[PDB]
Amino acid sequence: GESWQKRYDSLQKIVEKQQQKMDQLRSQVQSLEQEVAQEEGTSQALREEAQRRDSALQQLRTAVKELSVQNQDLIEKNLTLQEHLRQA
Amino acid sequence: GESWQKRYDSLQKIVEKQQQKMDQLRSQVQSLEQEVAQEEGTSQALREEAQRRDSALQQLRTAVKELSVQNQDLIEKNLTLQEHLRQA
């Protein structure tokens, strides 16, 4: 059979392969933490832009209503002028 | 000093402790891959909402433009009636 010294030499190869795998996993953890942080910045930026555009939506809807009031005003004035024209 | 069998046993304790740390790193990586996936899912969902919000904004800008031109035309038609009613 193999001597214990030979088995030790083979086991040290396993120890070194474990360390290399652990190095790769530690690097992957760091990269993933960075990806999470970057994606959180993206999501927060999207939420802030959504707030600004929701405010723009609000302002446009009210603008439509304001222009509808002006429309009614001008229509009523036009009818008043039309009635004056029936006495001209 | 220590026999090769005993040195093997000491090295095997290192193999086992490195395996524990490697398994813990793999679990951390899995948790971080879930965290990345959920944050990218959040960002994409916000982009979906943004696309529908921009559609609403575009439709409202169109309505504002249409109502504005209609009101400007009514203002011109009112001035025309006023000119027809002039006596001097």
Residue numbers in the entry:
A (entry chain B), B (entry chain A): 569 to 656
From the paper:
Here we demonstrate that CEP85 is essential for faithful centriole duplication through a direct interaction with the previously uncharacterised N-terminal domain of STIL, a key factor involved in the early steps of centriole formation. Subsequently, through its C-terminal PB3, PLK4 interacts with STIL and phosphorylates it, enabling STIL to recruit SASS6 to the site of procentriole assembly.
Additional sidechain–sidechain hydrogen bonds and salt bridges act to further stabilize the dimer interface. As with the STIL NTD, we calculated the sequence conservation of the CEP85 coiled-coil (cc4) and mapped it onto its structure. This analysis showed the presence of a striking conservation on the outside of the coiled-coil towards its C-terminal end (within the dashed box) suggesting that this region might be involved in mediating protein–protein interactions. NMR and native, as well as cross-linking mass-spectrometry data support the notion of a direct interaction between the STIL NTD and the CEP85 cc4 domain. Further biophysical characterisations of the individual proteins in solution suggest that the STIL NTD is monomeric, while the CEP85 cc4 is in a monomer-dimer equilibrium at room temperature and at the concentrations and buffer conditions used in these biophysical studies while becoming predominantly dimeric at reduced temperatures. While we extend the spectrum of CEP85 activities by showing that its fourth coiled-coil domain interacts with STIL and thereby also plays a role in centriole duplication, the complexities of CEP85’s architecture suggest that it might have additional functions in vivo.
